[model samples]
Target: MRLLLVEDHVPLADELMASLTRQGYAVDWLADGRDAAVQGASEPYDLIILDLGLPGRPGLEILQEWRGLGLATPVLILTARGSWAERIDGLKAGADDYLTKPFHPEELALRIQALLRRAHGLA
Candidate 1:
């Protein structure tokens, strides 16, 4: 399956892409949220990995916009801060799941798998 990853940090994005590829999935990385918002709205993806620290646009609004457009693609949010309110906001904005920074690869794998399973029940 194909997935979209929106992250600005180069090291993290590179490593995250490696892990996603390791799982044998096609992944696209976008550093800017503006591009991410536009592309995600028009394109079809199995899932989207959205980092809240994206530039050009607020990630929350991007997520909200995707939902506003009625795009049901499951979204898993990545947040640098572990603030409870922020996490809640992400969910309120329409995230299927959330992963905080300094996360283990296994943890990420588990969340991604769970979201994908829930989104693509056939898979």
Candidate 2:
């Protein structure tokens, strides 16, 4: 499946790309939220992995704007903010899943896989 990862941290993003590549996922990495918006609008992806702290724009704003435009691609938010309030905020803004930093990469993979399966079966 094709996934878009929007994160500014080069090292972590690189690690994620490498790991996901080994898992056989086609990943497109972008370091900013504006690019996320542009690509999210123009391309077809199975899932989107977005980090809240990013350059160019905030990932939450990008996500909100995309939902405002009626984009339905499943979004999994990855952030270091692990507060209940933060999760509530993300869910209210239309996130399918919220994964905090320091997470197990396999967990992220499983979540994405499950979301993809569910999304594809939706009416």
Candidate 3:
């Protein structure tokens, strides 16, 4: 499956991309939020891993815009701060799931797999 990763942190993005690739996923990485928003709205990705704190735009706003545009691609949010309000906002803006920073690769993979399975009606 193809996935878009919207993260500005180069090291983390690199590591995660490697891991996702090892799991047989095609990943497209974007560091800027403006580009990410455009791609998320216009492109065809099976899923998206979006970062909350972005450079050009707010992640929540990007998500809201994508949902407004009627994009149904599942989005898994990444946040540096673990706040209930932020989580609720992300969910309300159409995020499928969320992960806090400093996450384990195994857990992230499992969550991604679970989301994919659920999306496919296999959960």
Candidate 2, superposed: residue stretches over 4 Å from native: none
TM-score per prediction, in order, is 0.95, 0.92, 0.93
Could you give candidate 1's per-residue lDDT for residues 10-115 as a string of tens digits? 9999999999998888998999888899999888899999998787778999999999999999999997766677689999999999998878999899999998
The best candidate in terms of TM-score:
1
- State the local distance difference test value for candidate 1: 0.90
Local accuracy by lDDT, each model = 0.90, 0.86, 0.89
**Candidate 2 per-residue lDDT over residues 23-117, each given as its tens digit:** 88999998877778999878999899998778766678889998999999999998674567767888999999988877898888788878988
In candidate 3, which residue ranges exceed 4 Å CA deviation? none
TM-score of 2: 0.92
Question: Rank by TM-score, descending?
Answer: 1, 3, 2
On TM-score, who's better, 1 or 3?
A: 1
Model 1 TM-score? 0.95
The runs of at least 3 residues in candidate 1 whose Cα sits more than 4 Å from the true structure, single-residue gaps closed, are: none
| Model 2 score (lDDT) | 0.86
